[PDB]
Amino acid sequence: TITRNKTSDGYTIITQNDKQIISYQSVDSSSKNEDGFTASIDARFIDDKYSSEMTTLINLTGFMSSKKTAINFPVRYSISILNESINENVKIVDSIPKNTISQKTVSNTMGYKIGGSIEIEENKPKASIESEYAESSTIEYVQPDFSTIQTDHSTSKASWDTKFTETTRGNYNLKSNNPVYGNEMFMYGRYTNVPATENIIPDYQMSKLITGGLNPNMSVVLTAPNGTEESIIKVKMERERNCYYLNWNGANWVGQVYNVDSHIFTFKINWLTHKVTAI
Amino acid sequence: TITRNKTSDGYTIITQNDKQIISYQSVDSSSKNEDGFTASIDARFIDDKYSSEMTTLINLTGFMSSKKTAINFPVRYSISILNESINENVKIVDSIPKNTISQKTVSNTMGYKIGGSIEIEENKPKASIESEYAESSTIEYVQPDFSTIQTDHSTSKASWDTKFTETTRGNYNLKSNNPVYGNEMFMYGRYTNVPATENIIPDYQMSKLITGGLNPNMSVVLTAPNGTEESIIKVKMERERNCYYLNWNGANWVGQVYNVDSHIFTFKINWLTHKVTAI
Amino acid sequence: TITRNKTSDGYTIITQNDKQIISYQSVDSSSKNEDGFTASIDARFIDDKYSSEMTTLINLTGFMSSKKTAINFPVRYSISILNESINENVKIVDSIPKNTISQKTVSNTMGYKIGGSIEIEENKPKASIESEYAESSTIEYVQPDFSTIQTDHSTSKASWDTKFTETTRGNYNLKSNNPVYGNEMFMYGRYTNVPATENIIPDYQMSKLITGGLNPNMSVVLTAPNGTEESIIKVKMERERNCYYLNWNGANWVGQVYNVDSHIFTFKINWLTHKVTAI
Amino acid sequence: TITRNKTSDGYTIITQNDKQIISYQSVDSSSKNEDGFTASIDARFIDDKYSSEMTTLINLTGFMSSKKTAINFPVRYSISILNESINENVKIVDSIPKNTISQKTVSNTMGYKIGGSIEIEENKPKASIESEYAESSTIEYVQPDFSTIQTDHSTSKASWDTKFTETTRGNYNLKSNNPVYGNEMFMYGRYTNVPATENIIPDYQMSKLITGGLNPNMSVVLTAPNGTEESIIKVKMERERNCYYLNWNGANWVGQVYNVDSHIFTFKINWLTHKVTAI
Amino acid sequence: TITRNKTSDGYTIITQNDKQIISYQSVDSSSKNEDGFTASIDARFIDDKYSSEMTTLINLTGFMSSKKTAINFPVRYSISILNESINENVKIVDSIPKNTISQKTVSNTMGYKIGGSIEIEENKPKASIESEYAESSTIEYVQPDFSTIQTDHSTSKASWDTKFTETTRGNYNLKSNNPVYGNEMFMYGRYTNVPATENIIPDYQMSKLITGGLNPNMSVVLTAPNGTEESIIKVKMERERNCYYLNWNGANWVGQVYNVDSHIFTFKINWLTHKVTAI
Amino acid sequence: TITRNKTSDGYTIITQNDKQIISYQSVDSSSKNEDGFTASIDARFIDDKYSSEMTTLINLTGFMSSKKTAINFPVRYSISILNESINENVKIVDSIPKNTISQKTVSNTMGYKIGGSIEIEENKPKASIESEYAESSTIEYVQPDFSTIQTDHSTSKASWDTKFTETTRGNYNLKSNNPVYGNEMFMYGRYTNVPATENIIPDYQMSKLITGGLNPNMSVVLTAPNGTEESIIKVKMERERNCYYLNWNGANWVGQVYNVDSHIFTFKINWLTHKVTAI
Amino acid sequence: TITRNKTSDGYTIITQNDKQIISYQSVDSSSKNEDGFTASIDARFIDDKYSSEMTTLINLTGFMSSKKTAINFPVRYSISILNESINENVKIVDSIPKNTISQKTVSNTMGYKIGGSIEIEENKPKASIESEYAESSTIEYVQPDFSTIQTDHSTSKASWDTKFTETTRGNYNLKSNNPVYGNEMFMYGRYTNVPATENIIPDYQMSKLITGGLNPNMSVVLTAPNGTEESIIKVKMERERNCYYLNWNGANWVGQVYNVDSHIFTFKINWLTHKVTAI
């Protein structure tokens, strides 16, 4: 699979190799500083001699910053990729993150005990017999701090999102309700008797994704028939947040839990020149 | 992919190989001894025949020393990388350290017990029946001594930082408060009755990052269109510290916890000559 | 990347390979027998066709012997590497040993129990109900016998040191104080009633680094602009020791814990001839 | 890196390869049957085109047999390698066995329990409340049966040794002392009432190194400037032993614990001819 | 490192490769059916262009069968290899099986408990306080069923042997002595009341090496100066056995424990012709 | 190590490679359906340029079916390979399955407890002190369901066999004897009160080797001097079985345990033609 | 091992490689929809230059569907492969699935406890001494849900089968019998008081092989002398099923457990043309 050529001047020889798979890579980035939204697209174009149609791989990356008495704290992120050239026969054949099935560990035990006691006192007998029976079981599983679920996949739209799950210490969630303390999420001490600002929980116990932004990684595969030259890609990003509130109720420290930011980014693809640009 | 040439004098043959990916590497360092701040930049330039634009990888390393009655002890470090040639279309497409999601291990068990005892004394019966029911659960997780969170990523600025977390022995933190002993961080004995200097805790129990400086490792990827010749990189470093205080309260040994150093370094990049220098 | 040549006499052919990275290695050693100090420097010179400046790797090794009623026993070692050609633009860009962050394992459990007992005697009832509640937690970590902390890194000086930590049996340290036995480090039996020399602890329980010397391993990277021919390297070594004392207090065996050796070694480097020598 | 030659007679072609690293190996052995001492030296000579000086690797192996009422039993071995050509600039740059730092596993737990019991008798109440608090910790480590410590390293002399540590069953050592049984090392039964010879402990429980000899493995690296032709190596071997004694004290079986063999071997090295011989 | 030659007839080309290390292998076996002794020697001859002397590797294998009221049962095996050409400068430089050092696992724990109970009866107080303290330790190790110890190594003789250790069930050994049952090795039931032959223990619980023979694997390295042509190797094999006896003592089943086979094999080696034969 | 040749017609070139080790493989099978005995021999012939004598590897495989109130059930299998050409200097140098040494895990623990209780009643003291001491040990090992022991190895005969060991549930064996239930091997229920045929144990609990036949794997190495042309191999197979019997004894279900099949197969080997056939 | 040829027209060169082992593969399938029986045969033909006879590998695969108050549920599957060309010297030398030997884990422990209590009341002593002794053991093993046993292997016939074993929850089997509940296999609740159809057990708890069909994997090796052209292979498949029945007995829910499908498939093999077809 080599092509060679000789020359008269100096007997120069120029050999070249004929390869099967050739890829090209281009990257593009864009940002909206007012919302703390940044997105990058990495595109790879694959030239294969045995394939019937053109293939482009569209990786996505970026940063969604998380913003931070009462404290505002995010609760949900959402990312969507839209194919806007459907009438040109450009199609979304695959998306990398997928849904999986969890595993649980189960154990069961059953036991029997029997005991006989003879007690000889001074010329006095006390015979006692005892019997016991027991059964138990154990369940084990593993719990992430955030959960990512693919929600849609079609010829034009792939949509993913993530949501708040639970705290590592105390196992509280957004729906808990203690009769006299309300919601004890992000509460240090019930009776510390210090200013509200000082009663909040140390930051390190909070998840990294609440203090700092999420870092997406998503990939989509596109194909097209021979000759296609242009394509538009739209990326939609949404963020939802809520607020936690803490106050006095007599001597008790009690709390309670009660907008949406979004932006659309556009990119243009050139298949013939192997180029990706912002638009 | 080889180019060969012959010569008349001695039939000398000079073969050369044509490769796809060629990299170049240059390093530069600088320091500010008065603050104990040192920074190094390692730059790699990548020449790829199939890529549409130039790529430079900018690794960063350095040393931030930690300085050390009352004892001063650091509490937070912060590093920021700034791209200052935005109007020339030089862009930050990627940053290596990222945010991750932790895992927790959860177990639950439930059990039942039943017991029957027959006690025959001298012509005296004593029948007793007992019943028990129990439930329990266990949570497991892993805790670092320091925590690093990425806080910003954009076209121009990437900012990281680290903060104090907790002690390995005693699990104290910066917000603890015992009613009669105050804060027991870095306290050997409550009643040792020795001079204040002697009551401090042995150094080895303290984290390495408090006794000795942090060693950063950060990487940033830059790209540019064809022909770009120059670029300015700014690196900002900040350190925050606080003080611990211990005194007598009658017979009790009690304690309490109550500036910011910074510097900006500048580097110049030459794309055409593959050079990095201080400035 | 091959250069070939033919000859008339016997048609002798001499082929040579053109390689990218070429390294050279030289080693040098020196000692001071009076103090039991020995040091060795291994230098590697790297010739790279794609690098902008010369690089030399300076590994360091050696032996610091530990010297050994009252017994003298070391407590701290310290090593420092000094670059003495700063005005010639020879710079220390990297040092291999670094500071790291430890990990802790944390577990928490909470449980509930309930029990009902019915006791039918001869026409006599005795109903009893019991209830229990419990909580606990466990912390795990790992402890070395000696600890090495990097204390300084700059353009000219890199300084490391090591210190005594604790005993494997008994978990004593240099600051412990029992009211009636004093310090029980290196004490076999409180009441053995044998001569002082015989009451010391068997040697094997002591750490290897106290009975025998430390074996350093340190590496430093140096770079220089084209044409540099000479460089001076200074290596400083210090050792600190203390004494343990044991005596009678009536029938009780009690103890207590109450100079500094140093030397500077010099080496000369020749970049052009790829040579390292003592000086 | 190939040299080729053609010939007229039969067109014979003789190709040779030019390699970078060439090693040579020679071995020599010697023994002293009266003391059960045997020693072997394996020497490797390295020819490197990029090294500034000659290097020889001197591995050492051998057998030191252990000799075996009262029973004689070894307690310490010692090996030393001496370089006797210091005035010719032949130097010991490295020795393979080194000192290492051990690891300990530490755990701590704290727990709380609370219990309330209500006991209704025939019109009689008996309310009881109980409370418990507990704390504990665990230490784990690993213990060899023999211990090897490097004791000296210098330009001329490297010295190692090994010593007896403890028994696998009973954890006795050379300094133990029971008031009425003395030392119970190597004692089967306190009251077996059989002849002294029969009361000794079965051999298999004893360590292999006491029943049979130690098998040393030691390596030393030597270097020299160009042109060196000869070198003398001295190997010193010492063995220390003691005796265990057992007798009657009324009905009790009691015991107690109360020379040095050595030899020097000589070897001659020839650098130019790559030869090692006894001398 | 290739030698090539051309020919006129048909332009036949015969290329040969010049290799550095060439080995030759020959095997020989012999047996003595009357004693169930079989031995095999595998010899490998190594031709190395960079070595100063000839080397031969002498592996050994074979079968020693174990022979089997009163039952005869082996207790010790012994193998020895003798070099009988010492005056020709043929020497034993190495032997493969060696002595090793075992490892033990040690743990220690200490705990404290405290408990307070308040008991309010009908106008009657019963205050009780309890306190507990505990300490414990654990030792772990691993035990083979047979043990192999190298006992001698010299210029002429290498001698190994193996001995009986203990039973897997019951942990008995050759020196145990129960006052009323004697030795309970190989005894099924104390009171089974069946004929002596029937009271023996099932065979599977016995070690494989007692029911069936040992399979030795031993290796010895020999070297010689240039020109050596012949060598004699002697292999000595010994086996020791004892007897177990069982009888009635009233109603109790009691037992007690109270020649040597050997043979010498001879082999002849031819260095020049690379041959091994029986003799 | 290549031989090449050119030709005039079409310039045809025929290259051949000269290799060191060449093997040949032939297989043969035979059966005796009346006894359910099948045997296969796989023979490999090795041609080595550096070996002094010819080598043949004789693998063996086959099937021995197991045959199946009173139930017949096998108890022992035995396989023997016989070399019948001893007078032609054809010898058995090696046999693959061998005897091995097992491992046991041993642990020991010792602990001390002490407790002091103070009980203040209404003006009544009850001081109690308690003390405890405990010791324990644990033994672990692994148990196969069948056991294979090599029993003989010589110049002419290699003999192996396998025997019944124990049940996975209940740990019974062939020598157990309960006073009132006899042998409880293969008994479902003592009082099920169903026909004898129905009281047998479900088949799955029985070992696979009793329900279905054993699958042997044995290998033997033969060597011979140059020129040998023929060899006879005899394979002997034996199987032993016994019977289990169950009956009523009043209301109790009791049991008790109270020929030999064999065949010889013959094979012929041709060394010169590399052939194996039945005979 | 290459054959090359040149040509005049365009100097075309056609090189071919001579390989040692060449394989051919053909597959064939067939089904009987009325019984849900499907079978596939994959045949591989091996041409080896060093083998004395032809070899064909016959893999087998397929699907046997399982069919599903009273519920019919399978209980046994059986597969048999028949060689029908015995008189042509076509022979079955090997079959891949085989019988194996299981492993059990056994542990034993023995312990001793001793306790002394002193109780000083108001001028009243109560000395109590207690003693305890205990022994225990543990057995571990692993249990599949279905079991496959090879039952026959001969020159013409290889027969395998599988059978029902036990339930994962409750450990019931086909022979269990509770006096008042009968067989509790596939029974949800004893007193649920819902229609019979509703009391059956949820499907997921049942084994996959009962709800869905078995997927066989079997392989057989055939050999033949040179020149063989045709061969017939017969595959026999059988399935056995039974029924479970449940009804009322007063207030109790009780149950009890009380045809055979088969088919023969035929395939034809062509050795010379390397073809497999249905017949």
Author numbering:
A (entry chain E), B (entry chain F), C (entry chain G), D (entry chain H), E (entry chain A), F (entry chain B), ...: 8 to 286
What wording appears in the published article?
In the present study, we describe the cryo‐electron microscopy (EM) structure of CPB in SMA discs, which likely represents the membrane‐inserted pore form, at near atomic resolution. Further refinement and postprocessing resulted in an electron density map at an estimated 3.8 Å resolution (and EV2E and F). This allowed us to unambiguously build a model for the CPB octameric pore except for two loops in the rim domain (Glu76–Ser89, Ala283–Pro287), 4N‐terminal amino acids and several amino acids with unresolved side chains. Overall, the CPB octamer forms a 123 Å‐long ring‐like structure with a widest outer diameter of 97 Å. While the N‐terminus of Hla is located inside the cap domain and wraps the vestibule‐exposed surface of the adjacent protomer, the CPB N‐terminus protrudes from the cap as a short hairpin, which assembles to form a 16‐strand β‐barrel. We termed it the N‐terminal β‐barrel protrusion (NBP). It goes through the 25‐Å long N‐terminal ß‐barrel, the central large 72,900 Å3 vestibule, formed by the cap domains, and the transmembrane β‐barrel. The narrowest points have a ~ 6 Å mean radius and are located within the NBP at the level of the positively charged Arg11 and Lys13. The wide cap vestibule features a balanced amount of positive and negative charges, while the transmembrane β‐barrel is overall negatively charged, especially due to Glu152 and Glu162. In conclusion, the CPB pore has a C8 symmetry unlike the C7 symmetries of the homo‐component members of the hemolysin family and similar to the enterococcal EPX toxins.
CPB is secreted by C. perfringens type C strains and is essential in the pathogenesis of a lethal necrotic enteritis in many animal species and humans (Uzal et al, 2014). Based on sequence homology between mature CPB and other bacterial toxins, the toxin is a member of the hemolysin‐like family of β‐PFTs. Recently, we determined the molecular basis for the specificity of CPB toward endothelial and leukocytic cells by showing that PECAM‐1/CD31, an endothelial and leukocytic adhesion molecule, serves as its cellular receptor (Bruggisser et al, 2020; Tarek et al, 2021). The cryo‐EM analysis of CPB clearly showed that like other members of the hemolysin‐like family, the CPB protomer is composed of a cap, a rim, and a stem domain (Johnstone et al, 2021).
